[PDB]
Design a protein around this ligand. Structure first.
Ligand SMILES: *[C@@H]1O[C@H](CO)[C@@H](O)[C@H](O)[C@H]1NC(C)=O
Ligand SMILES: *[C@@H]1O[C@H](CO)[C@@H](O)[C@H](O)[C@H]1NC(C)=O
Ligand SMILES: *[C@@H]1O[C@H](CO)[C@@H](O)[C@H](O)[C@H]1NC(C)=O
Lengths: 215, 182
């Protein structure tokens, strides 16, 4: 279940000939930097069923060339990428390899990751509590803390005596920790009466049943 | 059911720093990157190793091409440069903070370029070099980068943290504070 991951092969750009003028570049008398950056994106619309390979090339701050498997050959996003488009598209040996990568790289790799990344599940830790201290200036914020969960697919809703509170909701949105876990705070703004019961419901794939916490 | 996912092979080479990177991303998170020097594969989470493997040499071969290509791009544009793009910094706890319970502080560096930065964790005004870790330069949807720095800590009302970040696109270093808020 530990097959070897495949990588998209980088192609050699050709120089010697050509040069562009007036490179409308921010400049800004700061420290000159030069970056060759490439992103090969495998998009899966339903597992390997349908796939789209999107390769994008950036020189410094601009995308100057790409390869979209929906098109089948390279296209220049800016003039600076025009020479490479013409060169690689002329190499049929290469255009084939690239087209094949949707299978040899994208689908290949997906099958490997489908064994541990696609099914990764970490159940959220759900907590509810009153915001601030006692002094209630104008509102009394109720915090529903949902943390340490994965994937990001989650639904956090507030209820007041069974009714779902739409307005008065304040969220930090989905927060990515960079370590394969997310966290979020969904706060409710209300004006309690007496025997008013508030509930935070959390739905997430890791769960077999929604999770509710009352206050 | 319909599984929608994105795997991105992100690589780059930068001058004059002479630095490169090669990593894989899954729905926004790092699966692994290759240490260009050691020439070894580094899995974001240890547990990933038992399910797959990657020949590091592949990353280095590609970096060599990215390196050669970088030179061509510089010739093709008469070494014209763009402006440096400063990052936005955000500090935050990984999870809810309870006094006495081990936790982790996160210094999130976002939307910047080139992929080079200097980060320093500060606890009570002093640089902390123990219990810190960081991610390589992570990709965004655009052409900019993001990075995560981490500091292990024990919540307390007597400690005061600062994440000091420096970039060629900043006039003065960016300094973000964080302390236990009840
Ligand atoms: C930079 O490119 C311009 C073309 O617009 C050229 O005239 C100039 O001489 C180049 N830089 C140098 C070598 O001065
Ligand atoms: C998605 O792919 C699966 C096979 O993996 C298939 O059963 C399903 O019909 C496809 N489309 C839908 C409706 O999700
Ligand atoms: C980052 O720190 C290094 C010290 O090793 C220094 O050479 C470099 O100038 C610093 N980067 C910036 C943007 O100042």
């Amino acid at each position: 279940a530990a097959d070897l991951i495949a990588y998209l092969k980088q192609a050699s750009a050709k120089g010697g000939g050509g040069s562009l003028v007036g490179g409308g570049s921010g400049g800004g008398g700061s420290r000159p930097w030069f970056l060759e950056y490439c992103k090969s994106e495998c998009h899966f619309y339903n597992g390997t069923q349908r796939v789209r390979l999107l390769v994008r090339y950036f020189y410094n701050l601009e995308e100057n060339l790409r390869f979209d498997s929906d098109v089948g050959e390279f296209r220049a996003v800016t003039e600076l990428g025009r020479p490479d488009a013409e060169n690689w598209n002329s190499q049929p040996e290469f255009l084939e390899q690239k087209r094949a990568e949707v299978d040899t790289v994208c689908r290949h790799n997906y099958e490997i990751f489908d064994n541990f990344l696609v099914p990764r599940r970490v159940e959220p830790t759900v907590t509810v509590y009153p915001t601030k201290t006692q002094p209630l200036e104008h509102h009394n914020l109720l915090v529903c803390s949902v943390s340490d969960f994965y994937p990001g697919n989650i639904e956090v809703r507030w209820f007041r005596n069974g009714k779902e509170e739409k307005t008065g909701i304040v969220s930090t949105g989905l927060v990515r920790n960079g370590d394969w876990t997310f966290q979020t705070l969904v706060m409710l703004e209300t004006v309690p009466q007496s025997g008013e019961v508030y509930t935070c419901q959390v739905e997430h794939p890791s769960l077999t049943d929604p999770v509710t916490v009352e206050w | 059911i319909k599984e929608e996912h994105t795997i991105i092979q992100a690589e780059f080479y930068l001058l004059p720093d002479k630095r490169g990177e090669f990593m894989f991303d899954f729905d926004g998170d790092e699966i692994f990157h290759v240490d260009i020097e050691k020439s070894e594969t580094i899995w974001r989470l240890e547990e990933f190793a038992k399910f797959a493997s990657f020949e590091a040499q592949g990353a280095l071969a590609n970096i060599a091409v990215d390196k050669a290509n970088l030179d061509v791009m510089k010739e093709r544009s008469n070494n014209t440069p763009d402006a440096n793009v400063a990052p936005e910094v955000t500090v935050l706890s990984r999870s809810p903070v309870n006094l006495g319970e081990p936790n982790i502080l996160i210094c999130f560096i976002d939307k910047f370029s080139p992929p080079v930065v200097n980060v320093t964790w500060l606890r009570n005004g002093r640089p902390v070099t123990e219990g810190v870790s960081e991610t390589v330069f992570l990709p965004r949807d655009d052409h900019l980068f993001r990075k995560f720095h981490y500091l292990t800590f024990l919540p307390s009302t007597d400690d005061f943290y600062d994440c000091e970040v420096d970039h060629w696109g900043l006039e003065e270093p960016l300094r973000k504070t964080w302390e236990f808020e009840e």
